[PDB]
Structure formats: C-alpha cells, structure tokens
C-alpha cells in the first residue's frame, strides 16, 4: 500500500543473475518397502498389576457356634406368705 512518488517513480523489476535453475528443483525421494522387524511376543511380564486395588480394608467375619447349653442350680426365692 505504498504511495507512488510522481517526482521519482521507478519501473518494474529487471532481470538479474540467477541461481542455476536445476539446483532449485529437488528430487522426489524414492521410498523403499519396510517392515516392523521380528516376531512379537504375545504377552509381557509387567512390573505392575493390571487390576484394581482397595483404598481401605474392611473387617471380615465368620460365624461360630457356642456349645451345648446346660442347666443350672438357681438360688430359689422364698414363699410369698405375705412377707414380700
């Protein structure tokens, strides 16, 4: 967006020496076929386990029984003959 100087104008570009025209043109680089080499193993001996863990520990229980329940020799009360 330059302003044209009317007192000192200039013309378009003139030819100048050039950079040997084939040396600015590249070759198209020619890929050969390739292979991810080797026979891959199916599994890996991992350093960490792959499953979930638990944040807190919960107390577990198992039921037990008591035993054969016996009789008893109670201390027996007195007879309510109007004193009680």
């Amino acid at each position: 967006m330059a302003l044209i100087n009317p007192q000192f104008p200039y013309a378009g570009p003139v030819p100048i020496p050039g950079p040997a025209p084939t040396e600015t043109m590249p070759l198209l680089n020619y890929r050969v076929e390739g292979r991810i080499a080797g026979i891959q193993q199916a599994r890996q001996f991992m350093p960490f386990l792959q499953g979930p863990h638990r944040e807190v520990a919960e107390q577990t229980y198992y039921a037990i029984g008591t035993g054969i329940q016996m009789g008893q020799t109670f201390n027996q009360p007195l007879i309510n003959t109007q004193e009680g």
């Binding site: 040396e23 600015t24 043109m25 590249p26 070759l27 198209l28 680089n29 890929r31 050969v32 076929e33 390739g34 292979r35 991810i36 080499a37 080797g38 026979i39 891959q40 193993q41 199916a42």
Partner: protein
C-alpha cells in the same frame, strides 16, 4: 525448528572460508538427522499362542 530438507529447500550446502590452512588440514563434519523409508507390514505375531 526448520530442519535442512532438500525436498523443501532445494540444494543446501555448508560453507567454510578459511584464512590460514596448514598441512594435513581437514574439516570434520558431524550430522544429526531423520530418515523415513516407509513400511507396509506391522505384523509378526505368532498365531499359535
């Protein structure tokens, strides 16, 4: 950031203009680069596993 790739820039050279050259004087270059050379098989899995 802009790797020297002649597919991108055409022919590129490295220039040294020496001032004093003694006898048995050599220039020891050292490069570091990438190169691709495509592939068609990612396989190699034992099917009897």
């Amino acid at each position: 950031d802009k790797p020297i790739y002649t597919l991108q820039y055409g022919n590129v050279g490295f220039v040294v203009n020496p001032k004093t050259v003694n006898q048995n004087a050599r220039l020891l270059m050292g490069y570091e680069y990438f190169t691709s050379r495509t592939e068609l098989v990612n396989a190699g899995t034992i099917s009897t596993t």
